[PDB]
Design a protein around this ligand. Structure first.
Ligand SMILES: Clc1nc2nn[nH]c2cc1Br
Length: 334
């Protein structure tokens, strides 16, 4: 038997039409700068794969951000570098400015354009209904671009969205989990953060595509309009699917498994149970109702689907009525 193959609905063959060196990052040669051009000012945050510092470029007194990479496979470093270089200059994509190594420790580090140390997670508590739509639209610009360039981000979450609210600009960061989409390729399902993992990751379906990012975006949107962080609050990867099933229902879940002939881990048998598909009104209350509208719920429903092929693409999402006012305002002034 085996699982049923799958293909992305959009941007399916974009990498095939590219020269090999565009996506064959294992053969990419890295252009190393001089780390003596940069002095670290202060630590910004600590991660599982890197440490982020505010720094200064000695040569031109320019503020930068330096991401010191924790030891990982050489090919993973080349992948993040190649993806950042391919996407450089794209809408709302963080700009990679330089690549350096410590002379003694040989530890690699990436230097980025400076952004204010404010991510989406810290800000959305004070956001109006319009601001949520505005910044969701800006994220969709970055996703539609990188998807059109044949790249899945695979780690979309509020922590990876830096926002300068005073200037109303945002940047999508942390491309260390991003990967090139190739039709027929099977990918590692051990990606993204638990609360944002798509059902394809949780049931171990490896032939996924750009639509993985659209599930993660739906998880972000639900947490913001409902003020429930996270929206799917699982204890682990198994319970994460249970939390989803208690909302989206078990019937569509098993139909999804049947459609792609997915061999489900037997542990799920005794924990998924039977659950109806819940109406989104269940999560509306007096403190979030000003963020919830029929347009928001209709848009959210079309993102959070078990069947990855049934989710809105980034471009389809940008044309939803949820963004009509945002589109009109950008047409007038931008
Ligand atoms: Cl602040 C910051 N963090 C990152 N993590 N991965 N890439 C990154 C770029 C910037 Br700028």
């Amino acid at each position: 038997s085996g699982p049923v193959p799958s293909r992305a609905r959009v941007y399916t063959d974009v990498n095939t039409h590219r020269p090999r060196e565009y996506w064959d990052y294992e053969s990419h040669v890295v252009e190393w700068g001089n780390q003596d051009d940069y002095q670290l000012v202060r630590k910004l945050g600590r991660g599982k794969y890197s440490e982020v510092f505010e720094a200064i470029n000695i040569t031109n007194n320019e503020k930068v951000v330096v991401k010191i990479l924790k030891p990982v496979k050489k090919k993973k470093i080349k992948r993040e570098i190649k993806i950042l270089e391919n996407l450089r200059g794209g809408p709302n994509i963080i700009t990679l400015a330089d690549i350096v190594k410590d002379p003694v420790s040989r530890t690699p580090a990436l230097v980025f354009e400076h952004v204010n140390n404010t991510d989406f997670k810290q800000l959305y508590q004070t956001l109006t209904d319009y601001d949520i739509r505005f910044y969701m639209y800006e994220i969709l610009k970055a996703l539609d671009y990188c998807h059109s360039m044949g790249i899945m981000h695979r780690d979309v979450k509020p922590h990876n969205v830096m926002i300068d609210h005073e200037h109303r600009k945002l940047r999508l960061i942390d491309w260390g989990l991003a990967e090139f989409y190739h039709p027929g390729q099977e990918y590692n399902v051990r990606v993204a953060s638990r609360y944002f993992k798509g059902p394809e990751l949780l049931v171990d379906y490896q032939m996924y595509d750009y639509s993985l990012d659209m599930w993660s975006l739906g998880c972000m949107l639900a947490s913001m309009i409902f003020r429930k962080e996270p929206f799917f609050h699982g204890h682990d990867n198994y319970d994460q699917l249970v939390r989803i099933a208690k909302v989206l229902g078990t019937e569509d879940l098993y139909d999804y498994i049947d459609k792609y002939n997915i061999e489900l881990d037997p542990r799920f048998n005794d924990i998924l149970g039977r659950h109806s598909r819940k109406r989104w009104e269940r999560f509306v209350h007096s403190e979030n109702q000003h963020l919830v509208s029929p347009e928001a719920l209709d848009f959210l429903d079309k993102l959070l689907r078990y069947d990855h092929q049934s989710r809105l693409t980034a471009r389809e999402a940008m044309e939803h009525p949820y963004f009509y006012t945002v589109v009109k305002d950008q047409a007038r002034m931008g």
